[PDB]
Design a protein around this ligand. Structure first.
Ligand SMILES: COc1cccc(C(=O)c2nonc2N)c1
Length: 468
């Protein structure tokens, strides 16, 4: 008999798995919401703000009507190469945002030392991709890498139809802190990472007024062979593609249909993405430069360093946020958590869900969320930034590992507003002027110099309907 080869690998469940890390795809969790788990690992945070700051050049008349299509293509060309490096070095890409990606090497405590060496090597090869790279006089095509290691907590929250996850705790805080100390082409180790690493492998230098360190060189011992060392390390990597599947970037490419598993995985993915995965919408429909309103919610916790406390609080906030967003087809695009603020990137006017009075509604929703979350047990401070304008939307990453992402000056502004004006609902000039609302509903704010924002315009507090 004949033996036709090639297993079919293009099932809906595989296409869904592209939008999720192995932490979720291979997770098998209890139904309780919230769900918490605890483990150890090495984290890599790759600052990609250098080439995602491109959103400005692609809004120009020079791109004719194809700014969004050109932007997604060039971003994915560069980001795909970073993803391949992380995946071949055995990492799990957790999440993408406009300005970063976060990757995880989950391992037993005894193996943290050797895995740090692997992740340092990966980081240096990432930098190597961008050595002679630019556009239109501008080698702003470089990255900044922060590494951390130690205890990691995972939180899964949601309802019967939607799920979200976060990694939290000190190593998570550390990796953000490490990456914001980095200059272009740097690899910064968190203080705990430096304490746990194989110091014989690396030459470091001090970071002024910091216990975190900069990797100058990976200079291994005389008898060292990285390839043999990496093969030993794969003993500890549960899902490293191997044997018959050594040619694949992810074991998740081999997932077979399983309705119970697919029911669980689909809850993490937006319905319009599922429509495209089901071949019920054109594959290019979601790449667009689209007017939206960003509602960026930040929740700060009473006891920030307690996972068992913050998980229920985030679940409670989430149940309210989701009910409020449903009323106006608002969507949670991302949830992120670092300086023990949990932040929800909410979007009004995504593709196929654009309501007319987007501005008035975004403000009313912001105030509703603000009032409710302010009364949630263990939530110390709620802060909400509201900004409106043209943003890039699209699926960003590699064919085998990608996520729908929103990128733009208005996303960065709403993020900055919630941090620089804590404890209140703020909005930009577009929102204020557009809203069908009387001027005494607002308070014109002092101008603050905010990181990455230049010419923010006048900013306002949404005070609400009454003096109170
Ligand atoms: C702000 O840019 C990012 C990019 C990738 C991940 C995060 C995150 O904060 C987390 N992702 O999962 N848990 C988190 N915490 C943030």
């Amino acid at each position: 008999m004949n033996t036709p080869k090639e297993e079919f690998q293009d099932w809906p469940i595989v296409r869904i798995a592209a939008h999720l890390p192995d932490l979720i795809v291979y997770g098998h969790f209890s139904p309780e919401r919230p769900f918490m788990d605890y483990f150890d690992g090495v984290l890599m945070f790759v600052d990609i703000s250098g080439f995602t700051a491109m959103t400005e050049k692609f809004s120009s008349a020079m791109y004719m009507d194809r700014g969004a299509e050109q932007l997604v293509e060039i971003l994915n060309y560069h980001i795909s190469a970073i993803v391949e490096k992380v995946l071949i070095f055995g990492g799990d890409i957790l999440k993408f945002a406009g300005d970063a990606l976060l990757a995880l090497w989950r391992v037993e405590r005894k193996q943290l030392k050797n895995i740090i060496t692997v992740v340092i090597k990966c980081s240096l090869e990432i930098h190597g991709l961008f050595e002679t790279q630019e556009w239109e006089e501008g080698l702003d095509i470089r990255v900044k890498i922060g590494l951390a290691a130690g205890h990691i907590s995972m939180l899964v929250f949601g309802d019967e139809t939607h799920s979200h996850f976060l990694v939290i705790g000190q190593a998570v805080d550390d990796v953000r802190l490490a990456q914001n100390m980095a200059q272009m082409n740097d690899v910064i180790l968190s203080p705990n990472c430096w304490q746990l690493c194989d110091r014989s492998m690396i030459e470091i230098e001090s970071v002024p007024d910091q216990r975190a360190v900069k990797v100058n060189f990976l200079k291994p011992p005389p008898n060292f062979n990285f390839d043999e060392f990496f093969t030993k390390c794969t003993t500890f990597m549960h899902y490293y593609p191997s044997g018959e599947h050594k040619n694949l970037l992810r074991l998740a490419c081999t997932l077979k249909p399983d309705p119970e598993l697919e029911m669980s995985l689909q809850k993490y993915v937006m319905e319009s993405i599922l429509k495209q995965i089901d071949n019920k919408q054109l594959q290019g429909y979601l790449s667009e430069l689209r007017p939206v309103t960003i509602v960026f919610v930040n929740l700060m916790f009473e006891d920030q360093d307690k996972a068992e406390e913050i998980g229920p609080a985030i679940q409670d906030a989430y149940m309210h946020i989701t009910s409020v967003l449903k009323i106006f087809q608002g969507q949670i695009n991302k949830v992120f958590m670092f300086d023990k603020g949990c932040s929800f990137l909410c979007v009004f006017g995504f593709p196929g869900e654009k309501v007319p009075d987007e501005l008035t509604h975004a403000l009313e929703c912001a105030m509703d969320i603000f009032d409710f979350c302010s009364q949630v047990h263990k939530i110390q401070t709620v802060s909400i930034g509201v900004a409106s304008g043209i943003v890039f939307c699209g699926i960003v990453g590699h064919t085998v590992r990608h996520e729908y992402t929103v990128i733009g000056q208005k996303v960065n502004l709403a993020a900055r507003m919630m941090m620089y004006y804590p404890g209140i609902v703020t909005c930009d000039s577009v929102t204020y002027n557009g809203s069908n609302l009387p001027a005494y509903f607002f308070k014109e704010l002092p101008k603050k110099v905010m990181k990455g924002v230049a010419d923010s315009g006048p900013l306002y507090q949404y005070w609400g309907r009454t003096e109170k």
